[PDB]
């Protein structure tokens, strides 16, 4: 008797904007960014990260009395550095290039801790000295991987070591000049005032003089210490000597593992769960392309955007018997999204058209993919470091970013708006066509009633209903009963 | 500050070892150099030497064949070993600390004593 | 070695009266050079250091200054509990060196 083409319909809440169009509820939808991270701070690929706890890098390689927990230091994924950490240059100093350092140790990881320069070697010098502000259960004391070489007898011998890079790896070497308050404080330690220290490889040809000066105090210290560091290549030789003030090595450290890596500026500690990529406020697990979690990212991680949500429809508008597309509705159609309901002699119901919906899905999933599988996702580690005397260089770093994220953003949010509005035109255009699909082969034996049913002339069974369903209908033998 | 005294036997042999030792009282050797000085009946006085926590040591270049200082691991005691005694050791031995340079540096030369201990006297004799 | 040379060997200087005593080494010892006070029954007490800087626990009575060879010991007014031994030391070379002594008696 009656075929209707119509469409699905659900009780979904789901809403989704367009270029035309704001708040429109759809049957399905697809939400393409991350929001949710875990609040932890994990192992990243299974490796922990190397918690500095209060330590500070320079901290951490001079040998901070206060940081002897990393004197031996296991392989890391990333490096947690405390904001304003505590320990680091106990005796009050500063440290050169020391941006670029914590730039070396990004990729980084594992390195091995080598003697180069024995502090017993040092005879003919006093290697005893130390001071109260590093002091450890009273008793002042010193950075423990370097020597402060000082008179001895009456005595400072020019002072000259070095050491031959036969490690296996490219080396780094930190050092370091003694700048006293004042005169007395020089000969006293030294012996001589018109001293140097110098220090060269093939590539490093560094000379500096004490800068003897008073200061203000800086944990009871009038004096500080300069220290500065380069990297001995493979079987290069570092030498270094000295009239006074030197501070050397007695450690060097061998790069072990150069992968890639990053510094995280954290209050938080280790956790022992994993993940992939690594926020500051906890670790993300999605598979989306967008979050909007925190720029500051260490890991293969989604692109960061300024957006609160970006939803695909995926679905129809959710627009909730005997009328089609017209009206829309079909609640109890729940087997595709798009049908027919046909009523005849034998009875009534609703069917999918599984060849249309199965198209319109694939297209869907296809479309939903192409937005997702070509963002390109790579390692990042994002965060740098600068000086104060680099301001500019900071603001130009600080400009890149936010001007690549004001692009990603713009361009996320006009994908999601321009792809909804193709959805759901696709949609509707696919219902249509049903309807005149259907409508060109029932030709002359149907009247079309208006609101997207055809009336059958003609009595219309269940085997016709079928036929007419998969596009097999016979016209011919039809043309009858008008 | 600490009090330091000596003490040991106050008679060696002509051909002997002398041996004496310092205890402090108040405090701890905590990382200054230590030293030995001695002051013959009619003399000023002559230093030996000095050693540090560490176990390290500057001798008197005159008796470094015959000198030995240590410390052990009381680490409030230090000890005066003096081989070949002739009896020209017969002395008035004393203990006392290097000054430190300052409150804050340690560990340094100086060369002046601050903390000074009473002294034995040590007959050579038979 | 630095031989530190001390004179008068000895001071009768009375009571309430200036006390000067004379150091003179060998070899400069810059500014590197202490005083002691030594007295029988007791410990050698620091004094000076650095040629005139005073050691804490001394009264101001005591001052000092010199420098290169030519040093001084100078007590601005000797009291009663002043009559001791006095003597350098240098400390501008290894081994360290002490002068002789020089005792402060009343005529």
């Known amino acids: 008797d009656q075929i209707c083409i119509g469409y699905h319909a659900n009780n979904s809440t789901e809403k989704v904007d367009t270029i035309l169009e704001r708040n429109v509820t759809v049957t399905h939808a697809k939400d393409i960014l991350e929001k949710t991270h875990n609040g932890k701070l994990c192992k990243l690929n299974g490796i922990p990260p190397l918690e500095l706890g209060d330590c500070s890098i320079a901290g951490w390689l001079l040998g901070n009395p206060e940081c002897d927990r990393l004197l031996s230091v296991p392989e890391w994924s990333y490096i947690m550095e405390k904001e304003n950490p505590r320990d680091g240059l106990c005796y009050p100093g500063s440290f050169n290039d020391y941006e670029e350092l914590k730039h070396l140790l990004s990729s980084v990881k594992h390195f091995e801790k080598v003697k180069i320069l024995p502090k017993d070697r040092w005879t003919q010098h006093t290697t005893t000295g130390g001071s109260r502000a590093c002091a450890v259960s009273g008793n002042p004391s010193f950075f423990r991987n370097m020597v402060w070489l000082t008179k001895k007898g009456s005595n400072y011998p020019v002072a000259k070591g070095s050491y031959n890079n036969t490690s296996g790896e490219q080396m780094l070497i930190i050092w370091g000049v003694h700048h006293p308050n004042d005169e007395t404080e020089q000969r006293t330690l030294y012996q001589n005032v018109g001293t140097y220290v110098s220090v060269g490889t093939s590539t490093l040809n560094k000379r500096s003089t004490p800068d003897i000066a008073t200061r203000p105090k800086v944990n009871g210290q009038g004096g500080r210490m300069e220290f500065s560091w380069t990297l001995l290549d493979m079987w290069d030789t570092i030498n270094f000597e000295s009239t006074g003030n030197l501070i050397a090595p007695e450690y060097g450290f061998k790069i072990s593992k150069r992968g890639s890596s990053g510094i995280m500026k954290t209050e938080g500690t280790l956790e022992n769960c994993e993940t992939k990529c690594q926020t500051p406020l906890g670790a993300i697990n999605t598979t989306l392309p967008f979050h909007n979690v925190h720029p500051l990212t260490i890991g293969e991680c989604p692109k960061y955007v300024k957006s609160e949500k970006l939803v695909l429809a995926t679905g129809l508008r959710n627009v909730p018997a005997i009328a089609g597309f017209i009206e829309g509705g079909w609640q109890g159609m729940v087997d595709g999204w798009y049908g027919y309901h046909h009523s005849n002699d034998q009875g009534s119901g609703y069917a999918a058209d599984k060849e249309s919906t199965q198209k319109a899905f694939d297209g869907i999933t296809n479309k939903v993919n192409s937005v997702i599988e070509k963002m390109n996702t790579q390692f990042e580690a994002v965060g740098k470091e600068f000086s104060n005397l680099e301001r500019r260089l900071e603001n130009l770093n600080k400009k890149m970013e936010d001007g690549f994220l004001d692009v990603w953003t713009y361009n996320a949010e006009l994908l999601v708006l321009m792809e909804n509005e193709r959805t759901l035109d696709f949609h509707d255009s696919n219902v249509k066509n049903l309807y005149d699909k259907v409508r060109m082969q029932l030709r002359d034996n149907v009247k079309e009633l208006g609101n997207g049913c055809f009336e059958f002339y003609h009595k219309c069974d269940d085997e016709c209903m079928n036929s007419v369903k998969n596009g097999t209908y016979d016209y011919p033998k039809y043309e009858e009963e008008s | 500050q600490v009090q330091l005294q000596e003490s040991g036997p106050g008679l060696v042999k002509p051909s002997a070892t002398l041996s004496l030792t310092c205890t402090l009282s108040?405090?701890?050797?905590?990382?200054?150099?230590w030293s030995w000085i001695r002051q013959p009946p009619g003399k000023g006085l002559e230093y030996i030497g000095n050693?540090?926590?560490?176990?390290?040591?500057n001798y008197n270049p005159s008796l470094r064949s015959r000198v030995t200082i240590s410390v052990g691991t009381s680490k409030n005691q230090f000890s005066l070993k003096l081989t070949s005694v002739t009896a020209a050791d017969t002395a008035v031995y004393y203990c006392?600390?290097?000054?430190?340079?300052?409150?804050?540096?340690?560990?340094?030369?100086?060369?002046?004593?601050?903390?000074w201990g009473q002294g034995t006297l040590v007959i050579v004799s038979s | 070695e630095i031989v530190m040379t001390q004179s008068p060997a000895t001071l009768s200087v009375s009571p309430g009266e200036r006390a000067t005593l004379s150091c003179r080494a060998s070899?400069?010892?810059?500014?590197?050079l202490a005083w002691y006070q030594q007295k029988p029954g007791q410990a050698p007490r620091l004094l000076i250091y650095?040629?005139?800087t005073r050691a804490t626990g001394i009264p101001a009575r005591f001052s000092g200054s010199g420098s290169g060879t030519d040093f001084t010991l100078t007590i601005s007014s000797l009291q009663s509990e002043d009559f001791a031994v006095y003597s350098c030391q240098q400390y501008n070379n290894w081994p360290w060196t002490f002068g002789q002594g020089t005792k402060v008696e009343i005529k």
């Open positions: 050693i540090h926590y560490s176990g390290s040591t």
């Open positions: 108040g405090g701890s050797l905590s990382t200054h150099y």
């Open positions: 650095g040629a005139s």
């Open positions: 070899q400069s010892v810059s500014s590197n």
């Open positions: 006392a600390r290097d000054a430190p340079y300052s409150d804050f540096l340690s560990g340094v030369e100086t060369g002046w004593f601050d903390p």
